[PDB]
Amino acid sequence: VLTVLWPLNKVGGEFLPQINEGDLLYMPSTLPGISAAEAASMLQKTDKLIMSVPEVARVFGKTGKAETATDSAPLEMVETTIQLKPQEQWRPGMTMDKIIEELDNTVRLPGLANLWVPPIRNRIDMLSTGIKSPIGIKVSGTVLADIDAMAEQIEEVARTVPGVASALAERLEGGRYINVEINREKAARYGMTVADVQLFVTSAVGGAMVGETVEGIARYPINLRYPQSWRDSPQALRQLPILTPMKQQITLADVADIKVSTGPSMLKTENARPTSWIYIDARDRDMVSVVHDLQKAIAEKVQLKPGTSVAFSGQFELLERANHKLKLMVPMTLMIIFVLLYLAFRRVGEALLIISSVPFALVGGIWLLWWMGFHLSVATGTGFIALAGVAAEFGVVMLMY
Amino acid sequence: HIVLKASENGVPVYLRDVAKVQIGPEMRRGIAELNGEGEVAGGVVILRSGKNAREVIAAVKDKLETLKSSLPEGVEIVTTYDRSQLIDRAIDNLSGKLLEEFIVVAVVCALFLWHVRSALVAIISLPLGLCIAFIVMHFQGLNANIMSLGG
Amino acid sequence: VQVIIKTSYPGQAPQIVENQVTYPLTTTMLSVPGAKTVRGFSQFGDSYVYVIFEDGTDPYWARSRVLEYLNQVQGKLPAGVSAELGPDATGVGWIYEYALVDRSGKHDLADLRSLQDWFLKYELKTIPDVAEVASVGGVVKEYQVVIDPQ
Amino acid sequence: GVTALRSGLAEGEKVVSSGLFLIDSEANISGALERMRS
């Protein structure tokens, strides 16, 4: 038993073995401000680089969201889907982890933090915890600036960690604004109500839909808008031509001040509390080692604020839950196994001698994991439970003789 | 010819007088790119929550054959993701494993039981062990996947 | 088990969507029988609420439950807005994915989005066990009346 | 449906019949065109 202590302090832990699916998703992240035009250019440049790798056969890149409620992606967010050639076509010395390394090393732009995941695994994780990456940290609180400061510090300590490849915390207020601060007194001068002025904002400047042409089963949007030259920039908006109700010819600045500002980019809420998610990408190391190393760096190099909490979520949240159920699961298995032996043989000290044969079966399993280079996971845990019942099975057929 | 105003004369002022009416793109809320050499229009098939992907993908691929005719000339549906390929690869794998273990044990329980009828007794212990299991899964509602086959 | 709630509040800033649509919604959904956790997404003109149920909850039980709580909240929302019930499926339900390409050019991006929206979507949704056929990318033809201020 | 040109192109030049190449709500036409050259 004392020899099984060497492989124990050697192996690492994961929630589950990373299952290889034919294809994988590229799900990079960036700061809140990016424009659609730029993000869509980012998408094509990123796609050409992915396609430049011999193992990938198709790259279906996506920015924004598809037309379904099952997709709430911003135009600033990219969810490109990579298909890989049959495993029979990969270069001689190749593995899935080796392909991802060439991808992560080939496909990289400034200010862009990449993330590579299996499709199915990803969709399950986001549905279960929200995080798109295996490792995730959740900064919560009621002050957006506070949680953002917190997530900012954590993000930088995270990158100091040995096994981390990238770490980016989404901002809760990195959004850019052009405020049209309508002046009631100024507008009243021209007999205009706030609603009167705003029509130029939603229609003249913005391209608000106004109606829909009917064409058989199909429908298409109709809109009203000034040519772009009039709404090019803040200064342009300050000269936005307005025909008043009394036919006075004025500019938008005559009834409003227009000021650039910063504010909420997108308001993530969990159980009615604001929250920012930090996406960490480590794939060389095992998960549990990284999370524990993050938990240290964070606790030591980041002093918490009052109403701000930090939580580790992602698969790790699942790992912890499964572990708690397993540690409670052994006694169960150990009392029942004890009773079935107790029933067949009827001898206490003897039945106790058989159930006491399983610790020797455990050590056999750990040593094999270590040699195979495997990690502890809900998979291996299961194996050890089933293995116990087989070592107790043997024990009975050795005692019966 | 949307009317905006009309004189007593009967001379109207139309929408063409104050604006140009053009066909343009709506605000894109989603962008799709294929192989880094062009923007494209795509489509995704979403499956009901507790339903069979492999089952659905078949109908989808067969409905597309019906539509190769109805589709305009030059139009090509290039598939960008197909979970059916994995299902097949995963279920062919587990099948293979089952077959291998079966034949491996038989060989073994036949080298420790020299008689063929003796080895063939422990051999008929498997194909029937399968049956009961599969008949049970059927009443249960369990489909065959790497995890249920892996069991 | 997840039930999606999508509310459109056009032109309204993120902070206003959160205050008048999302926050009211999430706080009423949190107290729905069987709700484990509830996430909210407040964008520029859009509200996404994701209601996650506890293990063993009959999926339809859940939807039917969210619907009735959606009735006793419809009023507490801005006049114009309405809380829409999302599809039966989730992101995991994305199964088959394709792109429409015309290499001759005879059909452009708008022509193909129309092909998808008004032909393909309806030829596929008839298929049993399919929750949605969603269009991704492409151009939606818009009749844009561009007014000259002068 | 067809616009006449006073100058700019030569008879015969090929041109793409699509303004459907820049997003309506907000690509800056000036710079969204720039991305197409270099």
């Binding site: 680089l49 | - | - | 006449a4 090929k14 793409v16």
Partner: peptide, 26 residues
Amino acid sequence: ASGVRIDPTQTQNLGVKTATVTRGPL
């Protein structure tokens, strides 16, 4: 440290809708 280069300029090889400039009357 991949020196793998890519063409940054926009690309469209999946089909273009084209017209030719014609001389004719309005």
